[PDB]
Amino acid sequence: GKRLFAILRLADGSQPPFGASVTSEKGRELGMVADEGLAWLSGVTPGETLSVNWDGKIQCQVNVPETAISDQQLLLPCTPQ
Ligand SMILES: [Co+2]
Numbered sequence: 064g065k066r067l068f069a070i071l072r073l074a075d076g077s078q079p080p081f082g083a084s085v086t087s088e089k090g091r092e093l094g095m096v097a098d099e100g101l102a103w104l105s106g107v108t109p110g111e112t113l114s115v116n117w118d119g120k121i122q123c124q125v126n127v128p129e130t131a132i133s134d135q136q137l138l139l140p141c142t143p144q
Contacts, residue, residue: 064132067107071100071115073123073141083117107131115141 071079078100085094088111094104109131114121123141
């Protein structure tokens, strides 16, 4: 499964800001965070680690479940490195 509807929230409960970028381990930009911490991600690999970037910096990372499949909405807890 490769396209994910990701609900992003940090460990502290906050939301990554509107306009943050989400990148794969490889460094590819799979999507951008919209409002309310929602990010549609393209070409995601199940099991990989994504980084969420804003303010010119990796702010936190998420672990895409190995069981992720296409068009799945899932919570991705974003934890600071
Ligand atoms: Co860019």
